[PDB]
Amino acid sequence: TPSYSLTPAEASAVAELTLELAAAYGSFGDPVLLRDLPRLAARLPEGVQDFLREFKLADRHGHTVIRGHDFDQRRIGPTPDHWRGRVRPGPEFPEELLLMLYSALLGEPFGWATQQDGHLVHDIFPIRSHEKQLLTWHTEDAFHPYRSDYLILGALRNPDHVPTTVGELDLSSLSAEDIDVLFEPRYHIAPDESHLPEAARFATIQRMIDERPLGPLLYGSRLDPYMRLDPYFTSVPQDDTDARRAYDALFKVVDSGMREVVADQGDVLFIDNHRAVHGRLPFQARYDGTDRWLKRVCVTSDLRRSREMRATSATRLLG
Amino acid sequence: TPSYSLTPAEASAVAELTLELAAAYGSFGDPVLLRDLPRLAARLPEGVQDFLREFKLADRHGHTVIRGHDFDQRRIGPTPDHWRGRVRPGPEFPEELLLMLYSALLGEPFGWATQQDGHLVHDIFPIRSHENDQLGMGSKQLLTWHTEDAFHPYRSDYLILGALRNPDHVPTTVGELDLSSLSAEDIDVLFEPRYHIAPDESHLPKNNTIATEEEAARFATIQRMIDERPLGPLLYGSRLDPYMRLDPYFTSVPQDDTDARRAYDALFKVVDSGMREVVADQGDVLFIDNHRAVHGRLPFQARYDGTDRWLKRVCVTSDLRRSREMRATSATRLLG
Numbered sequence: 001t002p003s004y005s006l007t008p009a010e011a012s013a014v015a016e017l018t019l020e021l022a023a024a025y026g027s028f029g030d031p032v033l034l035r036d037l038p039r040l041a042a043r044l045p046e047g048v049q050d051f052l053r054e055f056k057l058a059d060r061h062g063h064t065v066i067r068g069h070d071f072d073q074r075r076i077g078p079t080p081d082h083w084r085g086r087v088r089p090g091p092e093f094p095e096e097l098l099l100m101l102y103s104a105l106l107g108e109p110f111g112w113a114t115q116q117d118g119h120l121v122h123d124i125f126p127i128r129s130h131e132k133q134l135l136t137w138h139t140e141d142a143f144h145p146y147r148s149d150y151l152i153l154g155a156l157r158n159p160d161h162v163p164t165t166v167g168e169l170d171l172s173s174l175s176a177e178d179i180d181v182l183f184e185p186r187y188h189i190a191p192d193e194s195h196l197p198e199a200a201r202f203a204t205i206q207r208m209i210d211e212r213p214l215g216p217l218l219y220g221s222r223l224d225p226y227m228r229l230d231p232y233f234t235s236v237p238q239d240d241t242d243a244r245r246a247y248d249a250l251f252k253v254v255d256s257g258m259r260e261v262v263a264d265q266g267d268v269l270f271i272d273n274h275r276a277v278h279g280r281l282p283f284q285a286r287y288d289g290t291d292r293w294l295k296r297v298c299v300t301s302d303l304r305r306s307r308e309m310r311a312t313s314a315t316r317l318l319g
Numbered sequence: 320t321p322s323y324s325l326t327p328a329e330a331s332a333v334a335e336l337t338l339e340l341a342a343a344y345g346s347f348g349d350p351v352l353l354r355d356l357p358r359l360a361a362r363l364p365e366g367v368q369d370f371l372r373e374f375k376l377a378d379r380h381g382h383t384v385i386r387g388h389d390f391d392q393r394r395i396g397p398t399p400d401h402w403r404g405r406v407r408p409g410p411e412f413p414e415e416l417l418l419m420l421y422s423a424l425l426g427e428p429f430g431w432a433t434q435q436d437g438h439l440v441h442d443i444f445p446i447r448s449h450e451n452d453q454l455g456m457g458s459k460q461l462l463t464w465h466t467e468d469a470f471h472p473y474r475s476d477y478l479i480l481g482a483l484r485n486p487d488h489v490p491t492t493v494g495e496l497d498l499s500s501l502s503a504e505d506i507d508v509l510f511e512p513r514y515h516i517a518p519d520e521s522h523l524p525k526n527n528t529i530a531t532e533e534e535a536a537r538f539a540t541i542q543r544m545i546d547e548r549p550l551g552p553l554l555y556g557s558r559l560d561p562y563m564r565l566d567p568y569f570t571s572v573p574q575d576d577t578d579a580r581r582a583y584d585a586l587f588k589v590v591d592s593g594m595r596e597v598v599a600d601q602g603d604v605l606f607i608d609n610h611r612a613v614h615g616r617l618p619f620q621a622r623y624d625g626t627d628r629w630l631k632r633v634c635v636t637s638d639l640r641r642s643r644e645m646r647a648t649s650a651t652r653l654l655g
């Protein structure tokens with residue numbers, strides 16, 4: 001797995017640009033910052049731009065990491081209690097912007113209007129409210145036609161080095177018969193809850209919500225397939241014995257290939273949502289303000305493709 | 320409809336940039352050039368970048384033009400007799416690079432493997448032996464308007480047309496959808512899967528090969544569209560400001576669907592009467608949203624003497640990975 005380790009000079013240039021941008025724009029609520037993202041991202045170290053572009057275009061690895069960023073722990077401040085009601089942007093604005101720049105290099109930043117007040121940058125930290133653990137892994141929103149193309153996870157802090165799980169597909173482990181079955185629309189993938197704590201928009205998912213169209217698991221190249229796998233919310237018709245058999249073999253290959261990848265402080269992990277599944281590992285959280293803290297941006301290659309489910313032309317938020 | 324006119328200073332800087340890049344890279348066959356495109360495009364005048372970003376994000380107008388480029392006629396040379404058998408890249412390489420930079424501001428340049436040897440920037444100029452055909456390489460025949468590759472799930476999102484020369488000022492026709500001109504009932508019908516859109520012959524899996532497992536799977540989605548003839552909408556996206564895919568020549572309205580037939584005739588009438596003539600003269604670059612505009616071209620008499628109208632064209636996708644099933648390798652930008 002290709003990775004990029006920034007020099008102190010690169011790390012300094014990235015930190016500097018990050019602070020200069022945070023001082024010139026109010027928030028992501030600012031329309032012009034969103035406009036300017038790609039032009040602004042062209043001000044990053046050329047080596048960093050080149051690296052990410054090669055990852056995107058190679059379309060070969062499920063994940064990559066840019067390491068050795070300088071995240072000012074004093075400035076960033078203590079890991080907060082909750083995301084809700086919290087004033088945005090916080091002191092860690094610089095780092096959020098960084099992930100936004102990285103997102104514009106990859107595609108476009110987007111979010112879910114219900115998820116975390118619909119903030120384009122998502123918080124990942126322990127919460128006592130939403131607190132024997134089952135080690136699960138998945139494609140992000142595997143059911144959804146407009147699911148992420150890429151995920152960017154920036155580790156602000158990770159004092160106990162709690163890894164992330166990420167796994168890819170090994171084809172040589174599967175027969176040509178199983179693969180062919182997996183390409184066919186013979187599988188149900190259920191949605192997700194995310195409800196409670198606008199009709200023409202809503203009645204769109206209703207094609208999956210009422211009729212429930214069977215979709216494939218593998219698509220793209222047949223020699224190097226993409227995947228959408230969420231074993232927890234996946235269903236197969238009982239009478240489709242071929243499909244169930246091919247689903248078992250696919251699970252067994254992916255499950256056994258899972259790797260632990262640590263996003264330590266200063267790391268930014270890039271997950272290709274079409275080539276890799278990811279997951280959480282359980283950990284003992286302190287709640288004192290020193291807890292592991294990641295930020296997360298969802299990237300779409302094609303914003304306009306989701307227009308039917310977006311409120312207006314301008315909004316990057318779905319639903 | 321917004322456009323951008325370059326100051327002479329801006330035109331000079333663009334020209335200088337494209338000359339520099341022309342010397343620094345060998346050809347579009349160089350993978351590093353394709354990689355570098357978006358970063359290189361950030362060296363364009365900031366006004367231009369902002370303008371095109373705003374066109375892209377606004378997602379409202381169906382075309383725009385950037386006017387007033389300096390395309391050096393002496394360096395560019397005579398309009399060729401044919402696209403086959405030319406030294407690649409030619410003396411007009413700086414202009415091709417320009418369009419590639421613009422494509423990277425909008426999305427990703429891509430092509431069709433069967434079209435002009437898979438060249439990402441293709442030529443539009445009269446070819447004598449092609450005089451009797453309805454194509455870009457023709458002249459005498461009217462190129463009637465349409466969405467490019469209406470049938471194809473991976474058709475262009477944008478088209479970039481750059482006029483190297485146009486001595487007789489032959490306009491391009493482009494048309495948009497005035498939604499206020501249609502009934503709410505017609506719109507609802509046009510949003511419904513009630514229309515059959517046939518592929519252009521170039522896209523036929525029996526037309527191009529095929530033979531071997533690998534090449535067969537690359538056309539399996541198209542073959543299945545040919546076998547099952549699914550019906551689809553002519554309008555999609557947002558009901559208040561819809562995208563369209565309209566190719567009158569390849570659209571079949573089912574005989575028994577009276578509602579669809581009424582709405583299609585309504586849609587056709589609006590678009591046909593909204594048709595605008597837009598002249599891309601020397602130094603003009605035309606941007607067409609393939610989801611909001613139709614385009615065509617007027618007939619003209621070619622001279623075949625090296626002085627003919629000459630346009631360069633780039634197709635743009637907003638998502639190269641969507642067409643992965645139809646591309647040979649991960650790296651290729653060629654479909655088929």
Ligand SMILES: N=C(N)NCCCC[C@H](N)C(=O)O
Binds near residue numbers: 340
């Ligand atoms: N074919 C190769 N290797 N070209 C490298 C030159 C790119 C340098 C870039 N245009 C610049 O001036 O920064």
Ligand SMILES: [Fe+3]
Binds near residue numbers: 138139140278279
């Ligand atoms: Fe997840």
